[PDB]
Design a protein around this nucleic acid. Sequence first.
DNA 1: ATTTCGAAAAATGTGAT
DNA 2: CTAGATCACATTTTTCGAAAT
DNA 3: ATTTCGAAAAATGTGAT
DNA 4: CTAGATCACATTTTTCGAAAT
Lengths: 200, 200
Amino acid sequence: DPTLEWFLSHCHIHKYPSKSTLIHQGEKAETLYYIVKGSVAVLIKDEEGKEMILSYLNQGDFIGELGLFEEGQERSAWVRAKTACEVAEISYKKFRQLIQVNPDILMRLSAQMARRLQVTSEKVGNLAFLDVTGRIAQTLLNLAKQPDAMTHPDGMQIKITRQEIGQIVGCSRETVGRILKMLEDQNLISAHGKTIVVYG
Amino acid sequence: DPTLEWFLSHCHIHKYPSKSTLIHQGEKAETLYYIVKGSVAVLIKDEEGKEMILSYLNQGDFIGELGLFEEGQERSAWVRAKTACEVAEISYKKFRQLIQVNPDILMRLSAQMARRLQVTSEKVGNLAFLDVTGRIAQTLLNLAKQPDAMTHPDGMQIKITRQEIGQIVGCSRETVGRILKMLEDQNLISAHGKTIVVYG
DNA sequence: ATTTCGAAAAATGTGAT
DNA sequence: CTAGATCACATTTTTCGAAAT
DNA sequence: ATTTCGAAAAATGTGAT
DNA sequence: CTAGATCACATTTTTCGAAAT
Ligand SMILES: Nc1ncnc2c1ncn2[C@@H]1O[C@@H]2COP(=O)(O)O[C@H]2[C@H]1O
Ligand SMILES: Nc1ncnc2c1ncn2[C@@H]1O[C@@H]2COP(=O)(O)O[C@H]2[C@H]1O
């Protein structure tokens, strides 16, 4: 569309290879990102290094907006590329110039925040009310909805490690493993290595 | 300030008593609120009633905005009022227009969304990385930031039932007290009935 | 591109406490 | 009372860098 | 109307499980 | 294991509406 086009025009495009880091938690925030292609992972670490995945973002999604609204803000999390990415970049200052000449570009970003908030609040509840099995069940169902999910004859097929699932639901990798085995005993999913098919 | 004044102008200001709910999770959202005076608690419930305080929102905060950007959306959580509230209302439709002739108001809202994202995100970290003690600890510091909080000569002072805290960190009324005492013991806080002083 | 190949790096199951 | 977290490695699985089609 | 007062509800302190 | 949730009570704080002011 005419807007998310005149926008990329004022953006410096960059390419990150898979697994590379795009945003270091704690660093000064002054740049704003928009994913033209590929997908990233937004995660936070603890003093020990343990990682918790807050979300996956993809083509169309903005990154690093949380710093644009006030001076003195440091990145709130790490953002590591899930796949090779093509990322549009622009400075906050160079961006507020744009809001003042078509705030629609702002509504689009804002909508995306509104969503992230809802979604992240959702996770808070999951963590607070559901046991691990529920959270894992829930995550598999979500993961199956992500765009990087392939379609399988018996449902939707996905690739993820127990380690990673454990970093989404916040439980150990061992536990994920046992739970995965029980969901299969109940013919809910067929687990084979990193390939997990979620039955329709 | 100037703008926020202009905004209120088009808002059908109202009055809400304490314990009264402003938003019902699940209903169609078509209204945007603004707390002129008072304070509210945004909260969510489990399948059987349990509550989780996502956040306290005071004066100057907007309410029911996640419904503003997309269509056919439902309120994402319950919003009850702590003290008595003076809440400015306004329809999304009329609001959207207000933005048209001055995107600065939309900026303000978005700024508030951004901080709510960070905070909710940091809440996820806490729930996944910390044990109750750490959670209760962390909440205490935070509660000692809300406007309804007085200033003590040692740190700060607030009023909150052990029940509430149990609902903000996500643990039982018991655990909250047990760990609370341990806190007094290890001389780090000052408690008594429903009053607390955090040492800084 | 993606297919194949042989390391080399990562992810796993274990199961009593 | 009780969901899960732990712990160290031998054993799997997957990823990786180069040669091929 | 505002305040004062003594049941109820709400909130706790516990130790065991 | 081992933080925490539960359970079943006795014992305080607060909450509130009626009654005094
Ligand atoms: N809860 C979340 N959901 C989605 N994206 C997030 C979340 N928390 C942080 N991020 C993204 O990660 C970025 C980290 O740096 P910023 O704070 O600049 O901006 C943040 C967002 O782009
Ligand atoms: N995690 C949160 N942090 C802060 N405010 C929130 C959060 N979740 C919901 N809200 C507010 O609660 C409102 C509930 O209804 P809406 O979804 O219309 O808009 C929501 C926000 O204004």
